[PDB]
Amino acid sequence: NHLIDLSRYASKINIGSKVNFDPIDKNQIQLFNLESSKIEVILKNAIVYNSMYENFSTSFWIRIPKYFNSISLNNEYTIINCMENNSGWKVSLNYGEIIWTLQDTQEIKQRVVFKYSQMINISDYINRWIFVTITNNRLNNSKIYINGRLIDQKPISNLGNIHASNNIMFKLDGCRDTHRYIWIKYFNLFDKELNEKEIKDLYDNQSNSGILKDFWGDYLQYDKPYYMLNLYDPNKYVDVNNVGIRGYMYLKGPRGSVMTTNIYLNSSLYRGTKFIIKKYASGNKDNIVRNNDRVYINVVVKNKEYRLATNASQAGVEKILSALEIPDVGNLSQVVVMKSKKCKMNLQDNNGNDIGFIGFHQFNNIAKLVASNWYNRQTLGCSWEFIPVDDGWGERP
């Protein structure tokens, strides 16, 4: 009974003791810069690549922690190796780079590369799950796609016979940063050149769209503190002006930055009051937040949890939100419907009527958090990301 997804391609899988399978999402695999943190796939014979003509493709998801140290500048290290006797294919990484390399049996090699900057306020790529697809047409081009989008392509018809390895080695090789690691999931191989339509369908059908995601791309979870990023005002963070029904929550700037030299320079993500999502009526007994889960939102002020709520009877369509003592909520509106199918939070009263998506509104040059049905009809002010502390980001909370 085969359980590991790599078994599709393997007659045998050898897993080192320092491979870490994520306990919440067992398909997410963590590989450290240690010699026992490796997965060796002995390929089924029909999968071994050995041809001058056969088109082929590969896809995988990857999450690459931010490069912190100058030791990582120009240090290309292999992560997925299907080379034997200097022919085959491999995936490697470098500072802000993902590299695909083909090499034939005649010393001729070609690369296609995706590059991402670490000098950017908010990155789509640093330490966040990335869907990678590389397609190879032997009489034409190699192409690399990131999150379903074509990034680059290079001619490869000058390459002759490619005789790849009988194995695939998942392992950090040649990396000089002792603390380096990667996360990977859903490695696949295809015996054709995938078209743009097929690539987008893999991206979509491996995105688990019925499950809400945090900022890094992991499953959103209950009972886990999250810093909030509003995508419509990304340089601001959430704070509380008094707890209780007289108070309100509001966006305040600026975030400020985190930086080391010109190794990285990014917006600070660990800012403001933290949200904790509480189970109330979830679709499942596990700890994962799913589309249409009905939840309560707790707000952390001075290391104490309060309840996000509002009096929906206040004048006007924008209902200003407060942070209340949990016993003080009474019959006030607090039920939030979480949505993935980026406006994530829809507040409802205890009769089931919509009060509106959670966003913000300007009240005399103060951006107060609101529930507002203007959003439900309408990147919006209700677009939020949930950011937990993560070792791949390295900022000090």
UniProtKB/Swiss-Prot annotation:
Changing residue 152 to A/N: Decreased binding of NTNHA by RBD at pH 7.5. Changing residue 361 to A: Strongly reduced toxicity, heavy chain has very strongly reduced binding to synaptosomes, decrease in ganglioside GT1b binding. Changing residue 68 to R: Whole toxin is non-toxic, almost no binding of RBD to neurons. Changing residue 375 to F: Nearly complete loss of toxicity, heavy chain has very strongly reduced binding to synaptosomes, binds much less GT1b. Responsible for host epithelial cell transcytosis, host nerve cell targeting and translocation of botulinum neurotoxin A light chain (LC) into host cytosol. Composed of 3 subdomains; the translocation domain (TD), and N-terminus and C-terminus of the receptor-binding domain (RBD). The RBD is responsible for binding to host epithelial cells and transcytosis across them; this uses different receptors than those on nerve cells. RBD is also responsible for adherence of toxin to host nerve cell surface; HC alone prevents uptake of whole toxin by neural cells, and delays paralysis onset by 75%. Has 3 functional domains; the translocation domain (TD) and the receptor-binding domain (RBD) which is further subdivided into N- and C-terminal domains (N-RBD and C-RBD). Upon trypsin digestion the isolated TD forms channels in bilayers when the cis side is acidic/oxidizing and the trans side is pH 7.0/reducing. The RBD rotates 140 degrees around the TD in the presence of NTNHA. The 3 major domains each serve as a chaperone for the other 2 to ensure they act only in the correct host cell context. This is Botulinum neurotoxin A heavy chain. It comes from Clostridium botulinum. The chain holds residues 886 to 1295 of 1296 of the full protein.
